[PDB]
Structure 1
């Protein structure tokens, strides 16, 4: 049983009876003296936050982790070599520059990174974005000033890729220093699903150059994918059959083996390395049977051993690639943080979002100085490193050691590799991204505001491209928040069961509603896109407009005074005795510059008899009549207000108070009423006595005030 015996409280009488604690407000300056004030155990936290390898490496369990890290590092270093060779073709540079992208960030992240299960390298979507930024940069360059010229057009693409990488790393490091690594929260799940599904189609289309062995120019556009499709299918009579059959065989075999490893995650230690076995088989059969001369297949060429000397970044490339580098930096950090958060939740260790930006930015800067291209983690390579038994970032060190031993020593192998095997290995990781097409039907019957976000993200990314489509999709996703709260379902309430329960007036059968009281609920925060709808729904829920009846009352009072000081109608302390039956009954029209005296509050204290405005006026004067005398506003679900709302609500309440209708606001916490004091909302007319605790408090106050 629910039994309550209580006084009726009114948010001002409540705080008279209950002593508040009193908490000191923190202004701008004590935050400053709290932050910049050093201590011998304060700098030793910041330094260990900047170098986490000083914290995890002495706490290294040797006997449990070393033999697992060795095996995990070898098996992910092989995949890092092959994926680095494959993703350099998506930037259209020589393939040895993808091996440099798999070495330097994995060394910098070993010192400055906080994740333990992430392999750092390149991944296909970011390589497509870097290639688009490069071919957009070499077409905006100044034209400054016979036989070997198609090796010098790849010498400028390498420098453009290095400069784009250095600028993206600088943007990432500057975002990490300014401690704004919370920007991943502006990306909902529907936006990520739509972007991922469209970018999988981008990746699938851009691999058709190498499976068919066709020559496609460097389209950089809004509508790049359809131009690439037109350039491929205009010349499909010139394909190479030996490059197509091999890609089909490799894709089929790694597809039916890469799902045995998920069907049989138990029963089977160290899952089957199929990207290594198929590469060994393909490069061994392309040698010996002489595939480069029997057929005419494209191969990975002769890579020269060693590293390159450092480069100096071109500021002319920095001038006209800024909007591309911002998108590259944001996409790289968002992908890396989302992949690292899964294993951080799975193995229960903390993940610093601001240290990831510093580590990835430093890795990208050092990679771009030594002529690599940009990157962060890949989902498939991280899954290979984790599913083999990777416990920490020693596995990334051993993967970088294997990449180094391929660069320095054994790069004379992988010279008969057939360059469409490398394109078919990158298509084996598109299953989980393309299976997200079955989310339009799921989101259709659940929200319909996130289905719209999915469809608009897909369309913007397909039509506008990977960089500008994400920027358009974030803005549309912010529009849907305003769409959710434009027209809230406002309702009137009534009492059920003669108790303190008040629900919707249309929903139940024998609800009671007290005489002259109107309860109105708006289930949404009221802001600038919301206040005219609120005012319209309130004055249609109450039956009339208070400004119109105030104007008609002022007109009737003006006619009463005009007949009065002619000495026609008598004035008594009780009665309003008239003299004549009918007057000429004019409809006196007052012009502009005077029509706004009808909005003034009525002050009839000069007249002794109290006027009613609800019985009939003494001669044929026809002001309308209302039955309302009290209005409750249920503000429980109203989260915040702003300046437009405070002005509109102030106008509404001033119009209701001047027509002699008492207004009560009900259901707010103390932060709301404290914020309303800063807007200068209260004055001599709208007091602070209008706030009550619950609806039943206001109704019980009304039902004993009016008797």
Structure 2
């Protein structure tokens, strides 16, 4: 009773006016002069308009990217202790990091090795974004309170800044706090009106006369010399540029793909990789720090309209620049806070994530904690690795149950999950859902010994002094590592020694090849491998009689 089978041989003005206040900071947070953030936004929009495929996205300054480049800039400053002065040296450092990141992105795009973008899960990404949003929140807290705490960096930056704030809660400006409260209650085209009102009030009332920290005049136009990167700092920033490029292009391709799935569906991942690479090389020579697809802006916008944004930026870089100076830094802080509100709202729908899948929620929380309390790069690395390990954990504990026959059908279901299932005596069909390899080898052996009889104990009892065949269903066993071949041979040998016959059913072609290479089936011994659970069970029934 066997079957023989043979194998084969426009709206841009809004964003453009939202980007002006949304840069000074993302530039101040980045630790550079405010006009250079505007340079970054302008060059990013212009470059993406020249070449790009998203057709609905706002590439440019990305909070998290600015935070990472700022952390790298601060570390390089502390290492060097810095013509170069202060702003210029940091700006060159940022440009060097940008050039290296763009080179990495373009190399990955050309090599077609962009598969490294699949290790992010979007849950790791949401957690990482939320952690960075909290980090930006604490960074802007000192502008919110008009404080003057010393610069801090490294693991535990969040808690260190918070405890410094607690140390000198007092001795504030008390005008920045008041205007921050006013801007907060207004915010909760609102941003444009808010910045206009704040600028008008600061200019009319002479806020800086009361020691209120405000934005100084940023040099209009300028930037005439296209200073190339120094390239001596290349080794000192390469490791940071790796993570910067990975995050930037992964977020860009994710946003492009999601918007294309919304409509159009014409986004080519390799083309976006090329575009984000050239959005970090050509601008890098033009005093820029980074570029990536911005989550919030994209929401504000929702690529010709992008040109409009650039135009507005150019106007702000041509004649509207003095209209924006002498503006209190607290307004930039509250603007940053209300833009991070969008990423912060992900907390509200935490139960929805918990209901769908628990391990993902656990990965999300672990990534959040590692990317907020610890450093950003360490947080992302902890996230990617934790996700890879979680896949391993699912294999280590694997569903395993006996199988029962469904009446008037050949369907074999799980008796531990489905009721009214018939099992004839002397036949036990074991089912192991996960792959069998070195990790769950002991678990597979223990589960089989528990559901069925234990051959070793019964043999030792016999030496001191019902069930006759076992049908091991391998339908769900995707691969069998060297340890698996040995485990299966050992199981068969023990059960043969006790007096039981072990039958393998529904084996994958790959598992069949692995068993054949391991000499499990000997030389056409037969009665060991079967193509269906039903056929093997009927064969056992015949063999018993």
Pairing of 1:152-551 with structure 2 (within 5 A): 152-255=85-188, 273-293=189-209, 295-308=210-223, 309-386=225-302, 393-495=303-405, 497=407, 500-505=410-415, 512-545=422-455, 549=459
| Cα-to-partner distance string for 1:76-109 (whole Å, 9 max, x where unaligned) | 2222223222211102222111111111122221
More helix by share: 2
Maintained 8 Å contact 1:547/1:655? no
Instruction: Select 1:646's aligned residue among 478, 481, 485.
Output: 485
- Looking at structure 1, the residues matched to 337 and 156 of structure 2 have their Cα atoms a distance apart, in angstroms, of 22
Q: TM-score, normalised by structure 1?
A: 0.72
Gaps of 5+ in 2: none
Instruction: Select 1:634's aligned residue among 473, 479, 486.
Output: 473
Gaps of 5+ in 1: 1-7, 24-70, 256-272, 387-392, 553-621
Report SS of the residue matched to 2:154: coil
Structure number with greater Rg is 1
CA gap of 1:403–1:443, structure 2 versus 1, over 3 A, is: closer
Maintained 8 Å contact 2:455/2:498? no
Instruction: Select 2:532's aligned residue among 694, 698, 705.
Output: 694
Q: TM-score, normalised by structure 2?
A: 0.91
CA gap of 1:385–1:505, structure 2 versus 1, over 3 A, is: closer
Larger displacement relative to structure 2 (481-490 or 122-131) = 481-490
Deviation at 1:529, TM superposition (A): 0.8
| Cα-to-partner distance string for 1:421-468 (whole Å, 9 max, x where unaligned) | 222211111222222223444444554322321221122112212111
Instruction: Select 1:134's aligned residue among 73, 76, 79.
Output: 73
- Looking at structure 2, the residues matched to 498 and 703 of structure 1 have their Cα atoms a distance apart, in angstroms, of 18
Instruction: Select 1:673's aligned residue among 480, 493, 512.
Output: 512
Maintained 8 Å contact 2:359/2:390? yes
- Runs of 4+ displaced beyond 6 Å: 507-510
Maintained 8 Å contact 1:173/1:361? yes
Deviation at 1:506, TM superposition (A): 5.8
1:119 corresponds to 2:58? yes
- Looking at structure 2, the residues matched to 14 and 624 of structure 1 have their Cα atoms a distance apart, in angstroms, of 46
| Cα-to-partner distance string for 1:261-295 (whole Å, 9 max, x where unaligned) | xxxxxxxxxxxx222222222212222322222x2
User: RMSD over aligned Cα, in angstroms?
Assistant: 2.7
- Looking at structure 2, the residues matched to 542 and 432 of structure 1 have their Cα atoms a distance apart, in angstroms, of 54
Instruction: Select 2:49's aligned residue among 107, 110, 127.
Output: 110
| Residue-pair matches, total | 544
CA gap of 1:72–1:439, structure 2 versus 1, over 3 A, is: closer
| Cα-to-partner distance string for 1:139-179 (whole Å, 9 max, x where unaligned) | 223x69xxxx9x92233222211112212212211121121
Aligned to 1:656: 495
Report SS of the residue matched to 1:485: helix
CA gap of 1:108–1:656, structure 2 versus 1, over 3 A, is: same
Maintained 8 Å contact 2:146/2:174? no
